[PDB]
Point group: C4
Chain length 199, copies 4
């Protein structure tokens, strides 16, 4: 049924006047148009408000239902205690990225990581371009090491991701330490496909 | 009179489209329906906004009036200095739970506790299932010990609870230290109905 | 002109249904009615939003204009550098209190102080009841000492006050240290009208 | 197109009643009128909300487009790595100031700095009045030194500025340390046009 469509139309209308007030380039206006399309597919809800009204058991049932493909396609999540998984899902924040974008720049102090729900990113360490898709993640190396982004990451398609901050990362992993090593293992393989490591 | 009914109808309508957009299972949609029913009984107010407009003396008169049964049915509150009580009420946050739910999982790092206003929960330490109802609380052991949930707690009925975080717990108890021992006593009896203690 | 009257009528209407939903006593409902009357005199504005849109130079011109009587009637403010004054005004938060109320309870850990704009409070240390009115303040002793409220303070009339937290208090006084001693002097006179002091 | 004009008209209407309720002087009411004129030029958008809906890559494309003249006219920004620049833009907060105003007072503990986008400020250290315009900044000395404003800064025209807090300043400069010295160099020249320095 249509009604949260109008808040979208109503909001995006506001965006349109915002763009026009700032006399933005056309490529920008287009890009902004298409992003909204991809991020909201036409409706808009107070998801934050809706969620807040609910209880934890429900919110978890929702995020869990919504990330069934995320969870099944990702070994680290799929072969994990669904309680650790839940607690991690519950902290991801959804984000959309368009082709060309820079999700992560090299040299930058990294304070978050990403779970590719859907799309293809390009990783360029520079050495060779390694590629990652649905069921993968990246940017965990700054969360472990608290240093600089050991490469660049660039979206090739309309990515749909989930972000996790170092805060939440370290929280979930203090509660479920066994799982720190999973992320550790992966990070090393990658540091050794570069030529580095931490201590 | 009817008018805050509409914000409820208006909000829940939004929930309905939110659920449908996410193509949620029917058991979930039902569960979500019934929760709202139990948490809002049909109206919705900016209680947070209303409260903020008021002063402390009033807000306290309200929460106090509203928790008359909570306070009378609970020795620890009832035989306590109503000033300590007030200051504790004023920090509880209301929460509803449905049958089956997991209020508390074992092994999890605990950062809050609960005051059963109304309903029956099941405690499973696993050893025997101990039961708790109106006029009881639980989950105080992680607040005292800052370790892991020493059992599991599962709602049997539509519970109506009040939650207290460790922050607020420790604040109220620094102002009124005599009362730390009450919660202490209870926690031990329970640790000794298990087989543990802290230091 | 009338339009922010309606938000008041609209809000208070909500309060009315809130009160009725919670089946509050009549004395309470009356008290709540009269408070609103005294705190909003019938209109309601997004003062926080309005203010945020403004700049610092304006907000200060406003609070300054609005506290002309507060500032003139209070030696400590009136004989002070209007720059220190401004910076203090800018941090007060307006509060209304009704007759009978307990602004401050003895024994309680104190985290804020008050500037009587208008009304009469009663101070009971217990020894004798000392009285304070417009152009006075109180509750500065816990801000200096970080201990317990050295008395009780009870409104006799519909008080209109401004509150200052210890945070802001200590901030404004680190920028303008000369002024710490003013509040210090006053606090001692009062501790010696009791029988105490700090160190 | 007109629609965010109404929120402006609707908001400013509220301001008008706010001013009248507080019986503000006419010079103030005028001043407040003209400020709004200069800060919103007639429309109002949820820029914060709009921005939040967007992604980082877009927000940056916007702020970057909007600060083209800011960036080109300011050596420190223009001859800098546009990545450091971006990350700094992204943290500025827009502010408008009217003639006469005190942007910065001497002796005050300084917790932020300014980038003159457009307008002329007057600096009075007191020694001689030095002047600064578009493509300049000031108030960086307290950010480096964490002491007191080494002068006074007063707007001569309707200034349009961008503010940067010490927090964000020190964050951006920990990520891009080479750039600390730029701001350092400038600060010294200025301390030596006074007669001071830090250690
Ligand atoms: N060889 C690789 N294969 C896959 N992913 C990589 C490789 N090298 C780096 N990454 C990811 O790219 C990210 C770049 O930023 P981070 O250092 O935060 O974390 C890095 C890894 O998560
Ligand atoms: N034998 C028991 N009887 C009643 N309550 C208990 C018992 N054992 C544990 N609990 C409660 O169950 C809670 C489980 O989580 P906590 O460790 O936070 O705190 C525990 C107690 O509050
Ligand atoms: N003799 C007195 N005369 C006036 N005010 C007092 C006197 N004694 C205490 N007070 C005020 O009453 C306040 C009670 O709380 P505080 O200790 O925070 O600070 C105290 C003083 O500000
Ligand atoms: N001689 C000068 N020329 C230009 N700007 C100055 C001069 N002296 C001081 N300033 C600026 O004026 C500011 C006053 O506050 P700050 O100490 O924060 O930082 C100071 C400088 O940024």
């Amino acid at each position: 049924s249509d009604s949260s469509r109008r808040q979208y139309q109503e909001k995006y209308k506001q965006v349109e006047q915002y763009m026009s007030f700032h006399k933005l380039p056309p490529d920008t206006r287009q890009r902004i148009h298409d992003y909204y399309e991809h991020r909201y597919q036409g409706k808009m809800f107070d998801e934050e408000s809706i969620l807040g009204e609910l209880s934890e058991p429900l919110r978890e049932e929702i995020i869990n239902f919504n990330c069934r493909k995320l969870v099944a396609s990702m070994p680290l999540f799929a072969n994990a205690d669904p309680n650790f998984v839940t607690s991690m899902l519950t902290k991801l924040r959804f984000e959309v990225f368009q082709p060309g974008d820079y999700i992560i720049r090299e040299g930058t102090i990294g304070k978050k990581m990403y779970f590719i729900q859907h799309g293809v990113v390009s990783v360029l360490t520079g050495n060779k371009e390694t590629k990652l898709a649905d069921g993968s993640y990246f940017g965990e190396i700054c969360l472990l090491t608290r240093g600089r982004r050991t490469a660049r990451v660039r979206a090739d398609t309309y990515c749909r991701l989930y972000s996790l901050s170092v805060d939440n990362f370290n929280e979930v992993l203090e509660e479920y330490p066994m799982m720190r090593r999973a992320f550790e293992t992966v990070a090393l393989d990658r540091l050794d496909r570069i030529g580095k490591k931490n201590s």
